[PDB]
Amino acid sequence: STVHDFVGIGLGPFNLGLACLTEPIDELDGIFLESKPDFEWHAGMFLDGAHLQTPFMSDLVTLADPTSPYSFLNYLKEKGRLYSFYIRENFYPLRVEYDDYCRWAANKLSSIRFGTTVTEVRYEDDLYVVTTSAGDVYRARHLVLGTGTPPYIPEACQGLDGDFIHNSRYVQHRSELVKKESITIVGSGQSAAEIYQDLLGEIDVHGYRLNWVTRSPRFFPLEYTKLTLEMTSPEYIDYYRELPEATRYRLTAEQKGLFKGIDGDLINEIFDLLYQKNLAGPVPTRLLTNSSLNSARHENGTYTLAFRQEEQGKDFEIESQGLVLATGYKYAEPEFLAPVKDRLVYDSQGNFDVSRAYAIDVTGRGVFLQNAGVHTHSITSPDLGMGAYRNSCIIRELLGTEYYPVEKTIAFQEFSV
């Protein structure tokens, strides 16, 4: 029956931003399929005071069209909170506020189908046939994959017994963790430090042991200096994508400090808190680096975790009743892409050889990939501050026209000669 211009699979910030940007475009009509009954953005990490790491301009539309009615500032105006935000004079919205803002934006759009899980994608008669778990079938000429990056746990914890959790479900399991006699957090990303700051603040009223163990060499901060922020730019992606595949993969091993790590102010608040608590006596906490969790066993409601200090070359074990795996996220190719696997391009490492224009299929403009492209677009791939730019390039290729102006240079420095 009906054949749309494109189907959006998943409705996270990137595909929702595409939905807000394509809604006023008449000659371009797409639909978005989302498994959840409504938008929801990492609710398990809705800690008190938690905020974005990027300014409010990295919302769904502003960096492409500040006049769009779905901007964060327009959302604050409708809620009667714009003047209060003006006085707050903070660039970073709280996560619970950004999540409510996204739900508010998705509710203004009619191109979204909530409660719809894509289970099969087929290519028939020059059309992509999308089938959902409820049996509904959609057809279109292009696809925009925005399924995000699911949680990642070390394989040493796959099949582990007990009540251990990934950080993506921390808030729902907080009441149980604070009742235990010991808690161990694995990892040292931003989520680990937030949870560590959270549990360390109440370490007196509960009396547990708090262990923070990570494989990284240091609790390194997020490199947020402005000359480095210029690498989140179109001209750098131009230079980075043209590099040989071996150079891009070697860079990704050394560029994790540019988009991961801990907020510098959070590290300093954690030290200040440690200093404050230690005035009343020794604090029952441990912080270890260069230690990789290699195996874990459960018994009597207690975990025996085996680490190896890879730098020192020594093994040690830690016993703890609570286990929070703040081990990050990792993309895996969705199973619904199996019938069209022969139409998708791959690189010499088994991952999608994403084009400069964010395409992953043989035609070069049929299947578009949101996120999951660090090996081809560097730190800009999961960046909320580049979602409107990427959606601009996707709109430009889908439409042929540059509906939203796409900047070619933004940086004072040059990366290529």
Place this chain on the structure above:
Amino acid sequence: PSTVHDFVGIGLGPFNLGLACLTEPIDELDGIFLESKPDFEWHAGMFLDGAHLQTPFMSDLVTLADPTSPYSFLNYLKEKGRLYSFYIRENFYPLRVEYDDYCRWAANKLSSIRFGTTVTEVRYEDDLYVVTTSAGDVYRARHLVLGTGTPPYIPEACQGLDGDFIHNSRYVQHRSELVKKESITIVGSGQSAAEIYQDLLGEIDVHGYRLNWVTRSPRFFPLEYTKLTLEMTSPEYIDYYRELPEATRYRLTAEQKGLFKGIDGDLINEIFDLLYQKNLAGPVPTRLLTNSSLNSARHENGTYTLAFRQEEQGKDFEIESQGLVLATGYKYAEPEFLAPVKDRLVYDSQGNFDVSRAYAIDVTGRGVFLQNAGVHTHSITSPDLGMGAYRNSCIIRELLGTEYYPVEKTIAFQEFSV
């Protein structure tokens, strides 16, 4: 010549320009704006290097009334190809030259502005306000929105003073002359004076002049910018402040000076650090004096003879300076062109415009609207860029009868009235 507009805006500063930007998509409103200068220009004499706004960029021409408006600072940055650079800069306060460039950019997009037009006479006839220009043109409108700003103020001691002294509003144009002199004296301790002092103190070793900073103020007090005090820049505080007695309001205007005047706290601290840095190499020939009012001045032998009095201590003293920079502020004066319609304007017991809560100054309560110059009725919000959109939205509401842009009634956590 046969047209009757809904209103005529007199003067095109940031407040009336914001009204122009906000009424442009309103078809039921027919406005026209008359500006003396050939183009927009915003205190160009204070375009010192690095100088920036005291209010975040959301206090632009439209955003607090309509973030979706095409005349916002963010949309302007997007069009200039600078939006991502400002994103990385991560600074709420635009440069002054940047804000000026943005306002000229927005005025160029409108069709309702007549530049090079100086209003000389306003008359009332046939239930219409007749506005004559210096070129002889005549515009008729049902309403008026007055936005002529606040001209410079100099003390009575300097009226009819000889020499090359300057008010701070002409500093950038006279800077290359001032740095040649043997001594410079700054009078006043507002934000303008401190910016000039820092600029001249930064080059004190390159030019070898004495640098005097003398103020009538009791201290170099900072701009009170803490957030609970910022909540007084709100509509609910205006509701409270406006309905206070006239004597109470005039007393608060004398005491609320540190709320919207004074110096940025960061600038005061950077001044001290620079004094500390320069003092390492030897005595810095600079004087910082407070509680001292300039009572008399004369220009003889090519130099100035300033007579001060330390009002708190009660002792007179003199300062000799070849340069004189009066950073003594601005003050509104009733424009001459309103003379033929003073019978239709409402005044308080002090002789100033008894500006209504809805920003009207005429007898009907909705014919002549006043931008700025309303501190005695609207407190610190009167010259605040962060309340221009709010005032214009109330003005638009009185012109239409309907609230085109939503007008917030409460924004603050605290309460001011019981």
Place this chain on the structure above:
Amino acid sequence: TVHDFVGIGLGPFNLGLACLTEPIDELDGIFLESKPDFEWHAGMFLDGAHLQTPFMSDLVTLADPTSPYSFLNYLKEKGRLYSFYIRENFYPLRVEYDDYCRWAANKLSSIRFGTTVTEVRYEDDLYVVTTSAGDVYRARHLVLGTGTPPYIPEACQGLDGDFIHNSRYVQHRSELVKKESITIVGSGQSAAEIYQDLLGEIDVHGYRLNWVTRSPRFFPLEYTKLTLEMTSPEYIDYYRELPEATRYRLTAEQKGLFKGIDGDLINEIFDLLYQKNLAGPVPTRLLTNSSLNSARHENGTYTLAFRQEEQGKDFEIESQGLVLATGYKYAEPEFLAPVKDRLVYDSQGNFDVSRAYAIDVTGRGVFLQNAGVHTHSITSPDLGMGAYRNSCIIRELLGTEYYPVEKTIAFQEFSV
């Protein structure tokens, strides 16, 4: 046995005088403290609370950085100097500063704890100080350092119930958080710290939280560096020489210079209000320009009659908890009754403190720590000027200037 001086009270100002006078052998002093050990406003030991002056304003440093009683040498001895080095924060925590003073007073032998002064007499060119236990000390000079007791409004004198002055907040916090409603009177630094503490857990206990003050705004502590130059020797020289009526009118105008709120705490309070208001309306009220004029206690509930002094309207507030954060005030200690004929007073009844911090007819017999805002402006209760004042006292007691006393420190001139 007759000493050179007897110090009455052992707060930070007399303790600093103790550490500064220990190496001076030509001075014999003794200090009498009522309490068993040193304790500094322990009722305000809120979590994270810190000083409002940098650590260089400790007991000795601004007079002698080499003294062994410095905060830095204290940290060195506690194995915490390097951690403090990484902390890179000028402001010690309040519990830390209390522990530091306790560590310093207790390294000295000139302090007699558990000793309350009851009467002071002048008998043949000597000051004779008798204690509550009957013992008697004689000295040629006296150094009064008894501090400033809490102040409560007249509307609360003889008030029934369990209300507290903020100076006893830490002890009574467990019971206040049980109540259905809490009202804070005042808007100083103590009131805002308590408000921030109670607002942080307003969801946990679900009480209504009121913050009503007589101040016109929640004005911040004016802390910019050019204003800090008024905490200088040259400003006291200028301020003390002003006419007494000028000084008294100035004290009403310089409240924001030392009796406000830390600007960052004000901003933290607004952000917490903004944060909690996302979930729903926060049951809190913040009112200004309101004076507490009468209070009554009925069935564990307080009825507080307020008047908005600017608007001119009365209003009431019902609250089960009442925290008076209404500041402190110096009262003439009754043990000075026999020597009142030797003390100099001004036209308003307060001690006419000389520039050299003396309050007796000889200009060098009785010295007053603190309680001198009307003569020395904001420098009187300032920990940053405790070492300067003590070196001037030592200068009078010695005849020679032991510790170098700065004459000018500021870039600006206050006097012409």
Place this chain on the structure above:
Amino acid sequence: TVHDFVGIGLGPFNLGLACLTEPIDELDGIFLESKPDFEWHAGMFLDGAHLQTPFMSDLVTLADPTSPYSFLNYLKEKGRLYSFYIRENFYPLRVEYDDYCRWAANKLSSIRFGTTVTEVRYEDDLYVVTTSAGDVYRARHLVLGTGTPPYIPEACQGLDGDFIHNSRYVQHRSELVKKESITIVGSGQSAAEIYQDLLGEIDVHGYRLNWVTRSPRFFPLEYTKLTLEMTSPEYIDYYRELPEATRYRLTAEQKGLFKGIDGDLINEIFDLLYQKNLAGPVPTRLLTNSSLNSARHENGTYTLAFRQEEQGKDFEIESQGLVLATGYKYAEPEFLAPVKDRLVYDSQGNFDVSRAYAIDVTGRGVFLQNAGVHTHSITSPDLGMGAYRNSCIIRELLGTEYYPVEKTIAFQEFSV
């Protein structure tokens, strides 16, 4: 006359040793310095330049806060203590620290300025130190503190023209701004301060400003407090015990821990670029990943051959002015030639500095200040660990501890 030790060189580390050993009567030391007086990188005395470590990292404070040679006591003597207190900045200006170090050296009795060491011999179980003037000193121990001389790329060895290393920038600034083009090579803190200085006057002189660096990014100095805990005694113990190949790999991947740009300075450079770009296109280039491989001089211009080592592309830059901010490197001094057999080397040819900072076969005869990143990681050139290493050196010299040597300062653990 045979002393207990001879100090060779008088930089901050050996000057600190001199202040810490002055009150030790059981120790007889002497220090020999080539300069007529103390001078600390005066070629980098740009206006506003400050230390990157707090003032507690002075000559003595972290070992003995009571020492009369502390920065705070220097400020007291200069009548500048209160103004510094108002300044409330942890970082002294470089001109200030240089004046303070000169002040401390003039108070001491153990320094011979204008004395260059030309030879070191070992005979009769003593070290023989011969100066260029022919004077001969004997002592049981030696402490080497000759610093790290400038390093320039070998592509600039024997280069013609008026090019300079950044060590001499202030002396050549007047002539640099007259040229039509200036190129800075490298991206440490030195290069960034120079770029900011020249960019600030780019509208006054009309040169083109080039900033090219082999570094992959203009990375900031990692200064967050959990990383600062790696500058600690416990991290040195863990680090030194690691295998030698592991230590040499860490020195390559820890340049951002002490050899970056101050984060505030990066953001200021970007803001200045934003500001000046408002008026028009600013004539400046910033390039990374580019190594300088060849350089030749023509008339009064330089032709520089660069290679972007990542993109794999050669390019050239035409520049009249050349400023090499390429860092510093320790080379073994020639005066150690006769005693090389008594020194210990590792597999790479560098000194195998022990945990107690010794480099001689006896493990306690010759100590090395600085020049030990491969053995003590980022603490080796750090002013914040100068008093600690000097306290250990004094412990080895005196046989036991004189100043308290902390065993643990951090909250985290590095060894398991």
